[PDB]
From a paper:
In this study, we report the identification of an aldo-keto reductase with 2-keto-l-gulonate reductase (Vv2KGR) from grapevine. Comparative structural analyses showed that Vv2KGR has a typical 2KDH fold and shares the highest structural similarity with plant hydroxyl pyruvate reductase (HPR).
The ligand-free Vv2KGR was crystallized in the primitive monoclinic space group P21. Twinning analyses showed that the apo-Vv2KGR crystal was pseudo-merohedrally twinned. Despite exhaustive co-crystallization and soaking attempts, no sufficient electron density could be observed for NADPH and 2KLG in the electron density map. The determined Vv2KGR structure has four subunits (chain A–D) in the asymmetric unit, which share high structural similarity. Each subunit is composed of 15 α-helices and 12 β-sheets, which are arranged in a larger coenzyme-binding domain (CBD) and a smaller substrate-binding domain (SBD). This observation indicated that Vv2KGR may function as a biological dimer. For the four subunits A, B, C, and D in the asymmetric unit, the buried solvent-accessible surface area (SASA) was calculated to be 2443 and 2428 Å2 for A-D and B-C interfaces, respectively, whereas the SASA for A-B, A-C, D-B, and D-C ranges from 235 to 458 Å2.
Numbering used by the authors: 2 to 313
C-alpha cells in the first residue's frame, strides 16, 4: 500500500511510475540536499530503491531509522552497507540473473569494437575518408586468449560466448572454481601476462578496488586490451589513461568510469579505446525485468511473504 519509499535517482520511468502508484514515493532529487529529506521525512521512509549510482550508505541508513528493506535496481551491492543492514534487521534485495545476458553481450561487443576498430571504422566512412584509401588493418579476435577476472554468472556467460570464437579462456580469483576447463591463475599479474584480452567481471569490494593497477596493466602490455564492464573503481583510472597515452597498453573497452558521467579528456581523442555511458543492462527487455523484480521484492516484503532475490 501507500508506504513511504525513497527513490534515489531517476533509474527507470516504469519503475518510478509504479512506485508512485503503489507506494508513497519520495524522489531523492526533489530535495536540494540529502539533509532536506532527512530533516523532513526521517521516519517516513520504510524502503529505499537505489542503483549503482546512489544506494544506501551508512549515513543514509542511520538517518532513516524506520527503514526495513533496500531493493536495489542492480546486481552490484557496493553502494549498500550490507553489514549494517544485517545489524539493524534491514533486508536487502538485488536483481540477479536478469542482466547477466545483456552485460555479457556488452563485454563481447567491446572486445570486437576495440580489436576490430568498429567505432573508428564507422567514423572513417562517415567522414568521407574511405574515398582516399582502405582503412587500416586491425586485430583478429578469433583464437585470442581471454582472461576473466571473476567467474561468476556474468564471467561464466562471457566465457561461453568467447568459446564460440575459438578463444582460449583463463580466469582468476578466490579459490579455483570446480567444474571448469578454463585455466586458473592465482594472481591477476599472472593472468594478465598470459592473456591478450583482460575482462573485469567481479564484484567491487575493498579487495577488488583498483584490481587493474599499473602492475597488471604493465603485465598486460601494449598488445593487450582492458575490458571493464564492472565498476570504474576496479581500474586505477589515471594509470590506465597514462598507459594508453604512453603506449604501454594497446587499447581499452570501457563501459564504467571512476566519476561517471565524467570520462577523462585524454581518452576522448583515442582511436584504440571504446567508451560507453554505462549501458551494460540498458536494454528495453532487461530493464523491464529488473523493474519488475524490484517491485516484486517490495510487494513480497510488505505483504509478509518470502522475498524473491534476497542477499541478506
Amino acid at each position: 500500500e501507500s508506504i513511504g519509499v525513497l527513490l534515489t535517482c531517476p533509474m527507470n520511468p516504469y519503475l518510478e511510475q509504479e512506485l508512485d502508484k503503489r507506494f508513497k514515493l519520495f524522489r531523492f532529487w526533489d530535495f536540494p540536499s540529502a539533509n532536506d529529506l532527512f530533516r523532513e521525512h526521517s521516519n517516513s521512509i520504510r524502503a529505499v530503491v537505489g542503483n549503482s549510482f546512489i544506494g544506501a550508505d551508512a549515513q543514509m541508513i542511520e538517518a532513516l531509522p524506520k527503514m526495513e528493506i533496500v531493493s536495489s535496481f542492480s546486481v552490484g551491492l557496493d553502494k549498500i552497507d550490507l553489514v549494517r543492514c544485517k545489524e539493524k534487521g534491514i533486508r536487502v534485495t538485488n536483481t540477479p540473473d536478469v542482466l547477466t545476458e545483456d552485460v555479457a553481450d556488452l563485454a563481447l561487443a567491446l572486445i570486437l569494437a576495440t580489436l576490430r576498430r568498429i567505432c573508428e571504422s564507422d567514423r572513417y566512412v562517415r567522414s568521407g575518408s574511405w574515398k582516399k584509401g582502405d582503412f587500416k588493418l586491425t586485430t583478429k579476435f578469433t583464437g585470442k586468449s581471454v582472461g576473466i577476472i571473476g567467474l561468476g554468472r556474468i564471467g561464466s556467460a562471457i566465457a561461453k560466448r568467447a568459446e564460440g570464437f575459438s578463444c582460449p579462456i583463463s580466469y582468476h580469483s578466490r579459490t579455483e572454481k570446480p567444474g571448469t576447463n578454463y585455466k586458473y591463475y592465482p594472481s591477476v599479474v599472472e593472468l594478465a601476462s598470459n592473456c591478450q584480452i583482460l575482462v573485469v567481471a567481479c564484484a567491487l569490494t575493498p579487495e577488488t578496488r583498483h584490481i587493474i593497477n599499473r602492475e597488471v596493466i604493465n603485465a598486460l602490455g601494449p598488445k593487450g586490451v582492458v575490458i571493464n564492464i564492472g565498476r570504474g573503481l576496479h581500474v586505477d583510472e589515471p594509470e590506465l589513461v597514462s598507459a594508453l597515452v604512453e603506449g604501454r597498453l594497446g587499447g581499452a573497452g570501457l563501459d564504467v568510469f571512476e566519476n561517471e558521467p565524467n570520462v577523462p579528456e585524454e581518452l576522448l581523442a583515442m582511436d584504440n579505446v571504446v567508451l560507453l555511458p554505462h549501458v551494460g543492462s540498458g536494454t528495453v527487455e532487461t530493464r523491464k525485468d529488473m523493474a519488475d523484480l524490484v517491485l516484486g521484492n517490495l510487494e513480497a516484503h510488505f505483504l509478509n511473504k518470502p522475498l524473491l532475490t534476497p542477499v541478506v
